[PDB]
Amino acid sequence: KAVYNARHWNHPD
């Protein structure tokens, strides 16, 4: 499947 990481703010740790 494909996914968009909508939370580009929880990216860090």
Partner 1 sequence: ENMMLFEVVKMGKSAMQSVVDDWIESYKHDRDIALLDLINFFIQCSGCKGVVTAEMFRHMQNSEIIRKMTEEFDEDSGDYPLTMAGPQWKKFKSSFCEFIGVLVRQCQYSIIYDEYMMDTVISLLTGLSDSQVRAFRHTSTLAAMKLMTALVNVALNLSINMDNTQRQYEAERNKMANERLELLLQKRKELQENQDEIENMMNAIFKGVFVHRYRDAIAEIRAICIEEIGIWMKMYSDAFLNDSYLKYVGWTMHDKQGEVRLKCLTALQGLYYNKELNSKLELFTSRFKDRIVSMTLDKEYDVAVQAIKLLTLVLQSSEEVLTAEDCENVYHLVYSAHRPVAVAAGEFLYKKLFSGPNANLVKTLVFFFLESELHEHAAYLVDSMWDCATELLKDWECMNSLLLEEEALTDRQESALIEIMLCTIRQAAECHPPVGRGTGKRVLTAKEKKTQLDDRTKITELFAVALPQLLAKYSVDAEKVTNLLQLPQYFDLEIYTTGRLEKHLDALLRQIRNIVEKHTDTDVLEACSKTYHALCNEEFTIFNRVDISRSQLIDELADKFNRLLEDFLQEGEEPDEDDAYQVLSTLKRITAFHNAHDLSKWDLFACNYKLLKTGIENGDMPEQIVIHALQCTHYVILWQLAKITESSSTKEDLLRLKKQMRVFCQICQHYLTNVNTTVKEQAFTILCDILMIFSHQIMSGGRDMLEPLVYTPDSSLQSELLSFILDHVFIEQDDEDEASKIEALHKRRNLLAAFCKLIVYTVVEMNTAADIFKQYMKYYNDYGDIIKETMSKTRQIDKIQCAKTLILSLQQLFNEMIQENGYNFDRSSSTFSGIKELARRFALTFGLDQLKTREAIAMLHKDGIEFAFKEPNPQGESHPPLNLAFLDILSEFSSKLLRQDKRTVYVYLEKFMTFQMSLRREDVWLPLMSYRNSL
Partner 2 sequence: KRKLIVDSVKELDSKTIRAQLSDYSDIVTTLDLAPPTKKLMMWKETGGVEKLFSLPAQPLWNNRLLKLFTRCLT
Binding site for partner 1 (CB under 8 A): 2, 4-7, 9-10, 12
User: From CA 10, how far away is CA 1, in angstroms rounded?
Assistant: 21
Binding marks (x or -) toward partner 2, 1..13, rule CB under 8 A? xxxxxx-xx----
Shortest spacing between CB 3 and partner 2, in angstroms: 5
Is 11 in contact with 5 (CB distance < 8 Å)? yes
Q: How many angstroms separate the CA atoms of 2 and 9, rounded?
A: 20
The CB-of-13 to partner 2 minimum distance in angstroms stands at 15
Residue with tokens 């968009």: 4
Question: Binding residues for partner 2, per CB under 8 A?
Answer: 1-6, 8-9
